[PDB]
């Protein structure tokens, strides 16, 4: 089960329901395609990236790698994850 | 074990999992699935590579290691209009800025 | 109210360091004030000399972020069983995006410069708010 997530520049990013609805602001946006006007898609991808790696290293023995940045990234990335509450 | 890809075709992105020992042919089904085309009408591609049906996505490079979830691995994907494949073709992400002065 | 039982009785404990980060062990001592020990480089452990009811956090020594320890924010040595040490298993959490993102932002920029970055206001006091242990504790109270 899946949803659809749009960056600004028209990238188009499916990923499941449940890795989406990690965000509040989704969850809401949803209550089903998203349209993101202020995030662009080198931001919105590792978005999709980090509920990937939520979703797997939340609650689990196995060691935790650290999740990656890019100095490039970071700001724009610090925005949407503020406005995404995630 | 767990493999964790961006199965891409022109600004698409498709964000999923599969098994290392699971197929070429049934990654298809999942995007199948997804994008309401059958495998018949999907190319699976690893950078220039096209992907046969039965190999397993560990024989064709996308190990649990190597496709990791903060970091997965792409998938070109074409689709054939009625007669002919297109051409693999996946649109860019788009640019970060200038890092400000400050950092 | 958090601070270390005086027990004085011995318990030794092995702190191992899963992270990519230089650990910062702190023993809340008796009076509840943070006590810093020796760091741990990545991949690293010590065996230490501790004591039963004993409260210990694990921190990044350079930035004070947060780590946990057996899965938790505080770790107290309990009762040897059989000449066995405890394991300390010290991990980086999965932080939030925004967290994550933050740390990331702390480490390019020089405090002095935080004004200077394109952002709300409410993202400049964010950032201003660093991970500090008295808060922590104030928190966990
Ligand atoms: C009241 C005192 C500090 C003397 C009681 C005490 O002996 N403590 C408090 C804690 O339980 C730990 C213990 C202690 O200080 N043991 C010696 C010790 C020395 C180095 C280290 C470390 C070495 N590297 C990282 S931590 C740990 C313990």
Redesign the interface.
């Known amino acids: 089960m899946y949803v659809k997530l749009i960056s600004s520049d028209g990238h188009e990013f499916i990923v499941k329901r449940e890795h989406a609805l990690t965000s509040g602001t989704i969850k809401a946006m949803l209550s089903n395609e998203v349209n993101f006007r202020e995030i662009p898609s080198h931001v919105l991808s590792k978005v999709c990236m980090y509920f990937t790696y939520k979703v797997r290293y939340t609650n689990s023995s196995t060691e935790i790698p650290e999740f990656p940045i890019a100095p490039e990234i970071a700001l724009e990335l610090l925005m949407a994850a503020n406005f995404l509450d995630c | 074990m767990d493999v ?1 890809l ?1 199965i891409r075709r022109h ?7 599969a098994k290392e020992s699971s197929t070429v042919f049934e990654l298809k089904r999942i995007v199948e699935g ?1 994008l309401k085309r059958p495998p018949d009408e999907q190319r699976l591609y690893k950078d220039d590579q096209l992907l046969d049906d039965g190999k397993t996505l560990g024989e064709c490079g996308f190990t649990s290691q190597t496709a ?5 691995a792409t998938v070109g994907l074409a689709f054939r209009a009625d007669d002919t494949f297109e051409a693999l073709c996946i ?1 860019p ?5 200038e ?2 002065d ?2 | 109210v958090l601070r270390s039982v005086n027990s004085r009785e011995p318990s030794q404990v092995i702190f191992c360091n899963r992270s990519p980060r230089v650990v910062l062990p702190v023993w809340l001592n008796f009076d509840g004030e943070p006590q810093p020990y020796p760091t741990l480089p990545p991949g690293t452990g010590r065996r230490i000399h501790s004591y039963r009811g004993h409260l210990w956090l694990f921190r990044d020594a350079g930035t004070h972020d947060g780590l946990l320890v057996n899965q938790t924010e505080l770790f107290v040595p309990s009762l040897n069983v059989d000449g066995q040490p405890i394991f300390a298993n010290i991990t980086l959490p999965v932080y939030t995006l925004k967290e994550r993102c933050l740390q990331v932002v702390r480490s390019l920029v020089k405090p002095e410069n935080y004004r200077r970055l394109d952002i709300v206001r409410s993202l400049y006091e964010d950032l201003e708010d660093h991970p500090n242990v008295q808060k922590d504790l104030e928190r966990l109270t």
Do not use: C, H, N, Y
């Open positions: 964790f961006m600004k698409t992105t498709i964000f999923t999992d997804i990791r979830p903060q970091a997965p649109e992400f788009s640019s970060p800025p890092l400000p400050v950092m």
